[PDB]
Structures are given as structure tokens and as C-alpha cells.
Design a protein around this nucleic acid. Structure first.
Lengths: 103, 232, 91, 178, 129, 100
RNA sequence: AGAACCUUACCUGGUCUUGACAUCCACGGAAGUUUUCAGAGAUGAGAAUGUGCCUUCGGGAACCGUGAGACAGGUGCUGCAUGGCUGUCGUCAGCUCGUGUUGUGAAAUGUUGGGUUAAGUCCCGCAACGAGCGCAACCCUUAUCCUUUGUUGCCAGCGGUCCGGCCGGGAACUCAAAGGAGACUGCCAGUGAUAAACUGGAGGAAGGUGGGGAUGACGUCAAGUCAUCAUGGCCCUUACGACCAGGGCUACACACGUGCUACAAUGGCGCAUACAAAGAGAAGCGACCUCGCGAGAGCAAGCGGACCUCAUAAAGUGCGUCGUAGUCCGGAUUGGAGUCUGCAACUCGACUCCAUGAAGUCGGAAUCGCUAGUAAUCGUGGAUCAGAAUGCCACGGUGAAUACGU
């Protein structure tokens, strides 16, 4: 198997915003370089919360909440300084944060 | 009095949130308390303008505000001094320097919150309110949309009990999971205590306005897509 | 039985009162609220008046109590006997 | 009551023999959801039955399941100031399920040092019409032969059918007084 | 055309991955032997029941990888997983195995634990008076 | 609830967080077995009256908006009743109803 | 959702009143930092660094003390004074909006009859008409299946090779998150009043709106929250405010709701053995390391998370062992030491193990959930989370009787 050279990761709460930003990066990486891959989807996280539904009492009835967090990996085999420049000029998303930092 | 509140169940499909940022779990409270602070103090300074929504957005190193209004110029004020004072207190409230752009203005004369504000004023000013809600419902269905519900509370007429009344007309679905449907509940005071108006309005059963991408990966994006299948 | 693990306790509340009381050998019942705090060698021969929540009770400090806390001798709760309920606290 | 006709679950033949009668048996052998043990307890049981007679493994099982079998149940349906009893015919599917249920209730008190031996032994007795569920068959049949005297809310029901362009005989269909 | 033909053994949300080809009747289960995995168990008779039915015990070769389930349950998943892989000795094979029921995916699906209820449907228990 | 009790709770919590990160391996060094005939010194533990409040045992946080004790949720900085009110109004990113 | 202290609504003890904290004003001090000692600590006395900020160079602000006001502050009272919001009936199978008619009108009618449904679904039809709500649906999610990516995923074959995806390398393969594919009582047959609809048929993962979920009308019910939060009425504002500490709601007389685990031998024990899903972890956990009876310990590679760890996942499986004797089940209590999270383990937190060692053998009144991934039963993670899950949330393992009848 591969060893991770650098980690490009997108982390988001919005399921739709991450899908638009990764697709853009995948293009930018082809438009300023030669050695790109289709974005690995990478597994999505979900945190579970339960709270009251009435202001006071009504213990039976309750309410249940989800918050999704979506993770993409892309996996450019080699980023060009131009890929990283382009990525950073054409950034505009809010539902996602992209990390070009590594771990 | 049953049912979950109408915009909270619609957020996973085709309805936006009132805020969209990302904080990498550990900081999510520090961002929420600061985001709540921008909502609470910002709209408080622009009290004298007319407003339908507040949409808060956080790219890297920026907080970008989208704001929704009855007309484009109300929030700008004279020669940009009024809106620069707005970006002034957002930069102060947030942990980063601040941006603002104005949204598309859309259906402002029948819109959920600009109607609800309009009804609350009548009551505020101790006007008789004999027809006022019935004309709210009528003008909104005369200006667009496919159905409205109005429910009015705050001790109607000066009664010494709780006393509500309501009117729904056209089609207003209640358990709907598809399309944006616009709901606002205003809160405002008068002589006998606190009053409030509930405005559910329904424009249409299909809205496309937030989705996951159209296509599988290979036909979308880059021409040369193919993996090596080894070749590290 | 449960204990105090490994670490070092002198208590801040007792420390300034006890240094000046050992210089006296012993002085007047020391108005103490620190009923969470253990008994130590430095305190043997002192008189610690231990607030129980309503008022202080004087505790005589000596070698047979050094395994023990000021809160174990100064009470809180009440046990209702059942001829007729209990008025009083028990030491 | 009840808007439309509703079905039933179906047991599907077991993986070691290909029998519905074996797979329904292990199911009523299940204790605290722990089926893989009730599986061992059935297969070891079936082998002990093969040491008692080797021509078939089911020898005592099948014949217990004819001999401790209920044909009848008692239901009650008030006639005024009294309840009474009215005997009813059971369907074969419940006829069996009652027999199998009494067979395992009977295996769990034999007190022998493994359930594979208990269950083989309580079938061996109940096969000869000597075991524990003979009594349960007899008592339920004594009430069903005796309580043929009484019937279901006759006096008003009989009229409730005669007037609705039904017959001068009790119609066996929903939300009519029967 | 392939090196081993393949069945996915989907049974009650557990998956038996199962690779079939013609050979001498041989088994590898979880990079190890049958003795190891199903040691002194009825579970060896579970996987054999469909293979004995098409009478090819000493004829089919196999390689078996499995994630999820209980051990007695995994054997049960394999019992559909071998017959999923078998499709091409003859064309009718996958039809007649579906008709015997060993292609058929366990159509019962999970029910979520519900909010305000102590299980999936189990509403609370209270005597409260 | 009361604002004096909320004012107190909020003051405990910034020094809890401040002090305890820097004490992460200090508990083992000044107190446990690594302090074998080492440290354990009255002369550094006569300094702990300011740190009574700065303790991990007071790192219970409670609400960031209100300072109200009990039933807290650290990830919103809100509590049960107060999360739901905000989730209704769309204030919280990613928050939806669950169905599955 | 994790009540020792902080957690405080309660209670007791110290202590001041524009007041903990903001704005505004006047005087002194920079705020900040470091430090001994009396006092519980607030607070007070002394030490040492600094003298920033703006400047009619007066002086002020930031912040801290002092004072005047305006004022902050209050889970402080009132739920037939409220708003915001939500519970019940009940998945009842009905309820309402626009309008006309009939009655003098309240009001009816529709919203009612028959047949059928999950359904105001649909055949027929009356002064009810036209239409919406519930329901049906898009919907998420599962499930095959088509479908793409191809890693921190995967490995039919192939190379290095102990034959381990570790790596050269490979796409048959689950597999992740996502476009979605399919199913409509539509079809064909029987039934059914013509008919909706049910059930069979068949290909398929699947037939019955494919499993599951979201899902819950108008609104009485005088339901319930002033205590998230809004607020008139309405009270204190040397305080129903506020700094600082210790104590409690987990007491103890008892009754009672709930769950866990056991009462066995379908099991408990020892040794050995197997496969998870999903997610959380930077005050934290953590391989290897050495230490300890064990619990733990101190050291530390590493961990944006299919990268490392939590994690040994258990039930299940193997083998041997046990006999109604409270044992070979169950092992509680408590003395004592060893250990832990914490300046504090005593009443209100966790564990080992030494010594001794009980209740419980299916439980009276009472008492509930279920139509199938359901009930039943086992373990795991997470929300909260210094310490403490029997609970809650959700996940994956194993998984049932029967639905004749009203």
C-alpha cells in the first residue's frame, strides 16, 4: 500500500458544501498539475444528542438530534506549488474547512 | 399543541441553516456563542431598517454576513456610513476581521418575517385589529405563494385570558420533509404584556436550493481520473 | 476502607493558624471551617474548633486521632430514633 | 375491530437436516435469546435418541408430538350476569406449539446433569403416553367435553344477524354481535 | 471470465465473502483451517448442507473471508455465500439456488432504537399512582 | 440559579482550564511515585490558596451563554432546553432531525 | 446526563454597600506580574518589577478601590395575566378554510349512508359544492443492485515472502458516501356490488404504499414551564444584591417507581478460541518499556482519525469440571492495608486484595411491552464526563410464539 506523503483533508458539517469544494480542488489540481486522483470519499461521522421536548417535564416524549461531519481525503499524489496557490485563491466555502496541514 | 417547529426538520435537505461555519469540534461552542452574539447585537443596531433573514458564514480568517431586506438600500444608509458601523461591531464581536454582502431581495411584501413584523405593530400601537389578520392572509395570497397559515396570540382585544385566533388558507403542509417553507414567530410587547404572531407560509412543494452533487466521480470533474492500481 | 492516595496535603486554612499556635504550644479554640482536612503530627496538643455548618465544636488533638479527619469528629447529619424523632447531634 | 386480514411469520428449514419440524422445535427451545446453545441441546438430544433406537433419530420425538397434543381450548364470552365457558377447535399450527411448549416446560424440571439428556428422556416418556404433558392434555379435554353446555351471548346476537339481511344463523365476521 | 467467481453471502447485515472455482473439493476459511474456526461444531454441517444438495462436495474449491456476525451465524451466512458464488457450472444455477432460498438476502432490516422509548418499540414501564 | 452563584461558577472555570493543562504531568511529578523522596515540599504547597479555584475538580464548566449549572453540553456551550430552542431557529451548523 | 468543596434554588459563617461586572463622572492607584506573613478566605500590613494609554500636559480613561446619580442585578411572586414552546387523547379517522342553501335562529349540511383503505383511498350517491390538513408523497436511512472513487479501504491472481495488504504490486472482491436503480394492487388470476382494495402468480434482495424512520389534524383538555428564554402586574435594590468558605438535596422511619445482575447446571468456573459495527479521544488516552500479588505505577513512540488508541467486544465456540448441600451458584456487608481522580475521599467518588462473611432457591398486593430484526438477550462506544451508569442515546452480535375470534 501507499504511505501518506501529505494529507489534504476537508472537514465540514454541511453535506452539500464539501462535495462542491472537493470537486473544485480535483479540477484545480489537474488545471495546474499532472498527477491527481479522484477524491476518496472517506467515512462520515455522526454525533448523537437527546434533549427534552417540552420546556419542563414530559419525560416519555423527548427529542433527538443528529449533527453530521463529513470528511474528504482527495489524495493528490504530488501537489504542485501552483495547486496550493490556486486552491487558496479560489477558496470561498463556509460549511467546510479545508486543511492542507498534515497529521 | 403538538408538532416540531417547522424549519428545524428541513435542514438536512433543500433548506439552508441560519448559520454555516466549521470549527473542528473542540471550538464549536466558542464559535456558537460568538455567532449568537453577532445575531443578537447586529440585528439590534439595524432595528430601524426592515429585515427578513440573517445568514452567517465563516471562511478561513473571515466572517462573512449575508443579510436579507425589504429593499437593497435600507441597510446601506447614507454614503455607506450606517453599514460600515455594522461591519465595525461584527469585527469587534468575532475573533477575526469582518465582511458583509447583501443578498437577493425576494418576495419581501408577502415574506414570513416582514409580514409578522407588520402585524405585531398594529397591536403594539393599540389599534382595533378587527380585520387586520384577515387582511394579512388576504394580501399575502394576492402577492404570490400557494398557502399561508397565520396564528395570532397576545391576549386579543384586551381580554384577561390567553385568547388566540387563527386562519389558514390554500395548501400548507405540516409534516413536509421537502422544499424550503418559510416560518417566523415574532415576539413583541404591548400595554397588557408580551404578544406574538406565528406566520407559516408555503411557496411550493419542490425547491432544489441545496443538494449533493449530480453525478458519480468519473463523469464529473477531471478528464484524466484513472488510478494506477499500485505504482506508489 | 478508602484513603488519600499518594500526594502531600497541609491544608491552606490550617497552615497559618497552626504555625502561630504551635509557637504558643496551645492557645484558644481555633475557629476552623476546614472539616475536609486530616490531622497531622504538627497539630498534636492543639484545640481545633470545627464548624459543623451551624457552629463550632472543640476537638482535642492527640495521638489516638491522627488517623482521622476533623469532619469525622464534627458531625453533619441527623439520625432519627423512633420512640420519637431525634432533636440533637451525636458525638 | 381490525381493518384488514394479516399474515404470520414462517419458520424455514434448519441448516443440518432440512426440516421445518426441527427448526420450529429449536425456536421453542430458545432461552434468553441464546439459540446456538439450544442448537447444541437439540442435536445432542437427537443423537441420544439414536442410541435408544438407531433406525431413526426422531423415534420418540414424533410420537410424543402426537400423544401430548391438544385438540381443544377454552374461551369465555359472557351471557349477562355470568361468564361461562365455550370450547373452540385449535388450528394444527397452535395444536403442535402447545405440545412442544409443554415438552420443554417438562424437560427443564427433570433435574438430570445436561438438557440434551433431559429432553431426550421427557420425550421417551411422553412417547409412551407416560410423561408429564399427558395431564395437560387430559385436563383441557375434560373442561372442553363438560363445558359444551354454554354459548356466546346468544339472546341478542341472534337478532343482530337476522335484521341486517343476514341469515337466521350466526355470521362469523367482524364487528357484528355473534 | 475470472480466476475465482464470487458470492457476497449477505445474511442479517453480516457478510460472507466467498470465492468459488473447480478443483478437488478444498476449503480455506479466514486464512486458516475449518478445524480452527468451527472447532468441534455443528457449524461444519451448516455450510455443507447446500453443497451436499447439489452433490459437489468433492468438486468445488473455495476461499472464504468473513467480517461481522456470531460464529454459528457466520457459518449460516456462508451457506448462502457459496451458492451466491455458484452461477456458471450451468446457467440455471443461481435461479434454482434462489428457488431453494440460498441466494435470497434476509429481507428483515434493522429498526432504530427510538427516542423516548426504552428499546426499538418498548414504551416505558410505569405503575405511577 | 441566581447571578452571584453563576458569577462564582464562571470564575472557577477559566483558572481550571488555565492551571490544569500546565499540571498535566505535574500531578505525577510533585505528588505520585515520581516524587519518591523528591518534591513533596511545604514551600511550594503554601502557594495553593489562589489555585483552590483553578482546580480540575472545578472544571465542570456549565453554560457559556448563561453560566447556569447542571445538564450542560460542552459542544454547544448550552444545555438540553437551550440547545433545542436554538436548533428550532437554525442557529447551530449541521443540526438536524434524525431519521434512519 | 454524571449535586464531596465549585456545582448553593437551600442552609450556616465571615464581610461591604453605585454595589461581583459594564457604560458615564470625580480623586488616588497603571492594569498586569512576581512575594512573605496575620486572618479560613474575603481582607489587611510590608516587599519587588512596570509607570503603558491619551493629553489644554491640568487631568482623565483601561482596570482597581472610594463616592454622587442614572443604572446594573434578581430560577423574586403570579401558569384562569401572558408570550415563546410543548404534553395528552391518537395514527381517532376524523378536523377545518372559501361559499351557497334549509330553518326564525342557535346551527345543521359538507365532516353523514353502503362497500373498502394507511388514507377526505376509491366505486356509487343525497345541498352540499370547491379545496387543504391528518394520511398519502417527495424525504433520510436500510436493503439488494446498477454506479463511481481506490485511501488512513480492499486483496481471485502475481512478486520479496514466516504468505501477514507489511511492501513491489493487483481491481475478482467486500468495502466507504453518494447519483440513485426497483414495487404501481400497476400487471396477470381469484375475490369484491360495478369498484376501491386484499390475497395468490412471477422475476427479483424484495412484492403489498419492498424493511425502517421521519411522521401526528382543528383543538377542548382551565395540562405544564414566569426556572432556557421573553414580559406587564410587581417587591428588595447597606437587598429576593455580592466576594469568600464549609455543609445538603445521594439524609433514614419507611413505603413506592425504574433498571441492573443473580437465584444456576440451556449454566457458573478455569485454561484455550472466533468474527463487530459505529463513534470518541490534545487539561486527554496510548503500543513498547521497566515496576507491582493485583489494582496500579512511573516512562514514552504515537493520535484530525478506516493513520495511533480506547479494544481483550461479549454472548457464541472448545475441553475438562460441578450436583440442590445457599453450592461447585451468588458472592453483598465491614475491619485492615495496598491503590486511584482530586490540596479534600468523612458524611455524597473509583478499585484491588487480605481476614471474616450474609441475603437471594423464581417472589404477595402490584405490574408492563410486543405483529418481527419486533419481543427476548449479550456486549460496545458516545452525550454528559476531575471521580463515579444500574440510567440515556445509538450501534453491531444471537433472535421467538402466534394473529382462529371481537
Amino acid at each position: 500500500m501507499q504511505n501518506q506523503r501529505i494529507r489534504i483533508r476537508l472537514k465540514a458539517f454541511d453535506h452539500r458544501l464539501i462535495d462542491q469544494a472537493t470537486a473544485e480542488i480535483v479540477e484545480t489540481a489537474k488545471r495546474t498539475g499532472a498527477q491527481v486522483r479522484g477524491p476518496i470519499p472517506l467515512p462520515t461521522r455522526k454525533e448523537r444528542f437527546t434533549v427534552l421536548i417540552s420546556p419542563h417535564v414530559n419525560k416519555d416524549a423527548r427529542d433527538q438530534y443528529e449533527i453530521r461531519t463529513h470528511l474528504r481525503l482527495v489524495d493528490i499524489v504530488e501537489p504542485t506549488e501552483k495547486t496550493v496557490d490556486a486552491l487558496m485563491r479560489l477558496d470561498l466555502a463556509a460549511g467546510v474547512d479545508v486543511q492542507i496541514s498534515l497529521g | 399543541g403538538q408538532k416540531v417547529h417547522p424549519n428545524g426538520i428541513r435542514l438536512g435537505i433543500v433548506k439552508p441553516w441560519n448559520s454555516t461555519w466549521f470549527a473542528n469540534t473542540k471550538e464549536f461552542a466558542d464559535n456558537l456563542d460568538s455567532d449568537f452574539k453577532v445575531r443578537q447585537y447586529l440585528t439590534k443596531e439595524l432595528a430601524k431598517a426592515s429585515v427578513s433573514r440573517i445568514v452567517i458564514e465563516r471562511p478561513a480568517k473571515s466572517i462573512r454576513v449575508t443579510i436579507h431586506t425589504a429593499r437593497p438600500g435600507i441597510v446601506i444608509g447614507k454614503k455607506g456610513e450606517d453599514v460600515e458601523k455594522l461591519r465595525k461591531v461584527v469585527a469587534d464581536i468575532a475573533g477575526v476581521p469582518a465582511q458583509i454582502n447583501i443578498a437577493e431581495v425576494r418576495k419581501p411584501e408577502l415574506d414570513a418575517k416582514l409580514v409578522a413584523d407588520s402585524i405585531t405593530s398594529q397591536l403594539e400601537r393599540r389599534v382595533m385589529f378587527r380585520r387586520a389578520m384577515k387582511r394579512a392572509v388576504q394580501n399575502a395570497m394576492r402577492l404570490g405563494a400557494k398557502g399561508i397559515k397565520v396564528e395570532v396570540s397576545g391576549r386579543l382585544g384586551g381580554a384577561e385570558i390567553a385568547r388566540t385566533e387563527w386562519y389558514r388558507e390554500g395548501r400548507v403542509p405540516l409534516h413536509t420533509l421537502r422544499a424550503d417553507i418559510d416560518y417566523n414567530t415574532s415576539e413583541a410587547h404591548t400595554t397588557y404584556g408580551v404578544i406574538g404572531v406565528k406566520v407559516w407560509i408555503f411557496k411550493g412543494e419542490i425547491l432544489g436550493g441545496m443538494a449533493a452533487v449530480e453525478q458519480p466521480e468519473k463523469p464529473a470533474a477531471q478528464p484524466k481520473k484513472q488510478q494506477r492500481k499500485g505504482r506508489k | 476502607p478508602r484513603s488519600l492516595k499518594k500526594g502531600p496535603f497541609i491544608d491552606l486554612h490550617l497552615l497559618k493558624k497552626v504555625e502561630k499556635a504551635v509557637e504558643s504550644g496551645d492557645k484558644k479554640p481555633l475557629r476552623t471551617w476546614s472539616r475536609r482536612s486530616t490531622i497531622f503530627p504538627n497539630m498534636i496538643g492543639l484545640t481545633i474548633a470545627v464548624h459543623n455548618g451551624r457552629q463550632h465544636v472543640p476537638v482535642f488533638v492527640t495521638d489516638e486521632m491522627v488517623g482521622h479527619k476533623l469532619g469525622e469528629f464534627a458531625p453533619t447529619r441527623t439520625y432519627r430514633g423512633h420512640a420519637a424523632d431525634k432533636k440533637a447531634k451525636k458525638k | 375491530p381490525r381493518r384488514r386480514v394479516i399474515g404470520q411469520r414462517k419458520i424455514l428449514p434448519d441448516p443440518k437436516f432440512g426440516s421445518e419440524l426441527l427448526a420450529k422445535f429449536v425456536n421453542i427451545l430458545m432461552v434468553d435469546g441464546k439459540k446456538s446453545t439450544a442448537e447444541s441441546i437439540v442435536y445432542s438430544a437427537l443423537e441420544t435418541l439414536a442410541q435408544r433406537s438407531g433406525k431413526s433419530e426422531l423415534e420418540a420425538f414424533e410420537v410424543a408430538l402426537e400423544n401430548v397434543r391438544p385438540t381443544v381450548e377454552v374461551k369465555s364470552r359472557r351471557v349477562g350476569g355470568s361468564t361461562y365457558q365455550v370450547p373452540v377447535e385449535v388450528r394444527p399450527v397452535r395444536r403442535n406449539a402447545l405440545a412442544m411448549r409443554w415438552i420443554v416446560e417438562a424437560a427443564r424440571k427433570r433435574g438430570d446433569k445436561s438438557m440434551a439428556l433431559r429432553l431426550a428422556n421427557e420425550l421417551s416418556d411422553a412417547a409412551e403416553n407416560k410423561g408429564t404433558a399427558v395431564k395437560k392434555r387430559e385436563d383441557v379435554h375434560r373442561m372442553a367435553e363438560a363445558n359444551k353446555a354454554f354459548a356466546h351471548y346468544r339472546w341478542l346476537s341472534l337478532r343482530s344477524f337476522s335484521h341486517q339481511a343476514g341469515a337466521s344463523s350466526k355470521q362469523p365476521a367482524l364487528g357484528y354481535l355473534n | 471470465a475470472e480466476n475465482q467467481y464470487y458470492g457476497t453471502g449477505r445474511r442479517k447485515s453480516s457478510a460472507a465473502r466467498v470465492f468459488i472455482k473447480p478443483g478437488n473439493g478444498k476449503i480455506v476459511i479466514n486464512q486458516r483451517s475449518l478445524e480452527q474456526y468451527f472447532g468441534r461444531e455443528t457449524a461444519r454441517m451448516v455450510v455443507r448442507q447446500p453443497l451436499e444438495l447439489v452433490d459437489m462436495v468433492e468438486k468445488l474449491d473455495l476461499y472464504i473471508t468473513v467480517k461481522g456476525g456470531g460464529i454459528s451465524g457466520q457459518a449460516g451466512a456462508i451457506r448462502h455465500g457459496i451458492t451466491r458464488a455458484l452461477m456458471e457450472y450451468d446457467e440455471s444455477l443461481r435461479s434454482e439456488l434462489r428457488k431453494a432460498g440460498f441466494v435470497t438476502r434476509d429481507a428483515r432490516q434493522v429498526e432504530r432504537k427510538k427516542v423516548g422509548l426504552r428499546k426499538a418499540r418498548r414504551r416505558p414501564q410505569f405503575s405511577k399512582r | 440559579a441566581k447571578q452571584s452563584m453563576k458569577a462564582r461558577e464562571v470564575k472557577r472555570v477559566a483558572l481550571a482550564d488555565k492551571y490544569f493543562a500546565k499540571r498535566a504531568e505535574l500531578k505525577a511529578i510533585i505528588s505520585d511515585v515520581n516524587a519518591s523522596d523528591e518534591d513533596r515540599w511545604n514551600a511550594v504547597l503554601k502557594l495553593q490558596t489562589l489555585p483552590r479555584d483553578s482546580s480540575p475538580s472545578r472544571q465542570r464548566n456549565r453554560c457559556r451563554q448563561t453560566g447556569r449549572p447542571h445538564g450542560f453540553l460542552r459542544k454547544f456551550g448550552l444545555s438540553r432546553i437551550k440547545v433545542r430552542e436554538a436548533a428550532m431557529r437554525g442557529e447551530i451548523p449541521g443540526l438536524k432531525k434524525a431519521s434512519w
